[PDB]
Amino acid sequence: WLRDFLWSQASQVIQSYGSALSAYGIIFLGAHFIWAFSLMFLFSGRGYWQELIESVVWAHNKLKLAPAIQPRALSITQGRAVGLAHYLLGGIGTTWSFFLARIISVG
Amino acid sequence: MITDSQIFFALCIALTAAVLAIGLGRQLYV
């Protein structure tokens, strides 16, 4: 499955640069990026992010520009939702670009 | 070419080391 389907048929995606399917190549990479970006939200937790925002808020307050709407790390449910959304978008876009580039090139 | 007696002698020293390892583990466990 890894060799004769993914590796074998990824050729038409990866070799698409400089051709009309180069948009599919770019979206392949971008969907990969978003799928990986999702793992930040999926694995991490609000406490670290709120403390990091506290450090950044100190940096802003030192310059007299900390906003009236105080910044907070995303809620726990929201972090899970954002991770899930990015994970689904990245995976689905990866498959989308892969299938479209492969099938348009060969068929 | 390593000989059978050589392998057996090394194995005997390894067994002595094993006994000492059990002893050290005991003494660290107490």
Binding site: W7, G47 | I2, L28
Partner: protein, 731 residues
Amino acid sequence: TKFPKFSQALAQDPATRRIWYGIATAHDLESHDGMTEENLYQKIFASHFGHLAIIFLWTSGNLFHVAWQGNFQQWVLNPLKVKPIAHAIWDPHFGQSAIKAFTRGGVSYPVNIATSGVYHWWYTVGMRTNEDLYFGALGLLVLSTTLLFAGWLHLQPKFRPGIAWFKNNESRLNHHLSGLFGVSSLAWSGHLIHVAIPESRGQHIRWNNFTSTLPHPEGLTPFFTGNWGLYAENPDTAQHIFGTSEGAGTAILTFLGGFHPQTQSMWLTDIAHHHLAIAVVFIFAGHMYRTNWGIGHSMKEILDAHVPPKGRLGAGHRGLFETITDSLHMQLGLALASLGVATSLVAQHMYALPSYAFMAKDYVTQAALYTHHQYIAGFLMVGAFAHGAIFFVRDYDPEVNKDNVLARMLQHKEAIISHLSWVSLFLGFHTLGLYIHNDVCVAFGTPEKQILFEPVFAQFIQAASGKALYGFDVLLSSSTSAASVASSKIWLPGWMEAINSGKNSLFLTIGPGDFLVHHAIALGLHTTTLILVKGALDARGSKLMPDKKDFGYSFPCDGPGRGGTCDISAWDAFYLAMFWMLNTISWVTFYWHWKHLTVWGGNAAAFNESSTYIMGWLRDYLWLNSSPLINGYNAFGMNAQAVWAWMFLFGHLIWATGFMFLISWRGYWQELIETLVWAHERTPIANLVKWRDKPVALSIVQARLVGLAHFTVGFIFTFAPFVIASTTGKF
């Protein structure tokens, strides 16, 4: 007497988490029930003894296996063609096809082809026959036997060392510098001069005749007369063949530099001189500190006085002696940071300056060693930072460090964290943006629009070191400069040729791809440091949890109140930064492996062209070089790389299973285990068989640990296969 005897709380714990947490806090000796400092130190000492014995047993096992089942003698005759054998395979699951495929290396039985370089190491060091390897294994076995007995002995009542002796810093540092580093390096230089240079020059020096054979024809008369240049006179010729007397010199201590032409490794005379000199330095430096004879230094006095004028660094280094000598976690963190930096240094230096004969042409071993040592360096760095955090949350005393150089770190931790965030953000934004610009430009059929920054500063360093293809003509590149002239009769006549020879990995040519990937490496290092430094500095407290030190180092959370407090403990900072350690080391190893595959294959204009965009990495490195691995076994048959393919998929599977513990958390699994408990208790027949520990879902920190474990093991398995099999299949 229940399993966690060291922790009565887990002893009363009735669920299955008792076993997990007992195994997990087995070695957390500081927090055990009824523990004293003296007992802690003695137990640590005995465990160190056992650990050393393990190391030497591992070494003896490698030596014995190469002696017994390896083709060391055949490999010695033809190092560049015969493939080194690690050990024989004993597997009843092997078929006839796998048997025939794994039967290789000029032996009649299945074997594993060594990729650790131990063959090259021992051949360079002076081993020529299986008997020498077997005797080395025997002696290391005896050494481990003695170390185990020493560990047992140093827990006895009359032989239990005291806390004052343990905290005697000056004597320990004096002895480690002078003897553990210094005299041991002197011993290695003596070994080289007595056994390795003669064996390279075609002389069989062993225990029976090393006492009779003179390493130099003159003897020690030059050493005593002070005419030490006679030991450099008559160096090895450029036509020398390793292991033979033809073209062999008589010099034992030289500074020729460069590389040995036949083996493409540094001269053994150079290495012996290195170890001799370096030992002089270390044996001198080991007389720095005061130990029972008045003359010397006082580390507490040094730290106390080093406070700059007008209180620039607050109170200076006052109290740092007390904190370091009282807290073992700070010592552990310093040791781990130093050792991680050293591991990165050896990884960067072994490939650029090979020291073992014929290792440079062994492409699989070089990649395996670089990846191995870079990964261990990353782990050591993460551990150093984690133990710094544990020190801050457990052992830090602000009363002792009032207005200290260490307390000021906590004072402006907000500035530090914010600026690390800034630099990480800048690096990532710009590196990713330039990579995407290059991606889109090459994608749209116009690579000319790529933004390609020449790494002019690194190229300038290469020119100053001796490179000449850039044409900068600065320092050593300019033959005329003081730097080039002052060293023109010691090392430059060889180093210049070595660096400008294009057949070497010494100071590889660099380009825009190297610029971009180096900025990516900077992003990885900076973000890992951000996560780790933030964890260390916020371990004591935060605006969201000022009393974090009361909870300690590793606790699940503070609850959903105050908006949620997930991963707030500063252990979760380590667990987060581990992902970034893996990420940055993966980037480093991909860069190394692709650039070196291209250089070895002779098409550097594949890396220089494709590495500027990310699809080049995805295609000309991963996809292109994944064929010999994934074709290890297919529908038509199998090759000797089928083990690498199976382990590749194995690491993929473990990496994937880690996502389960990282994403799905305890409540789902707890309720599901309630359902399973109901089913087991209610079904007939099976309900006679009943557990003793109540089965519960894994704790939160436990599951974070398990998920990260599955991630890391996975990472290493996947790249090990891909780095060991693609290189073999491509060369």
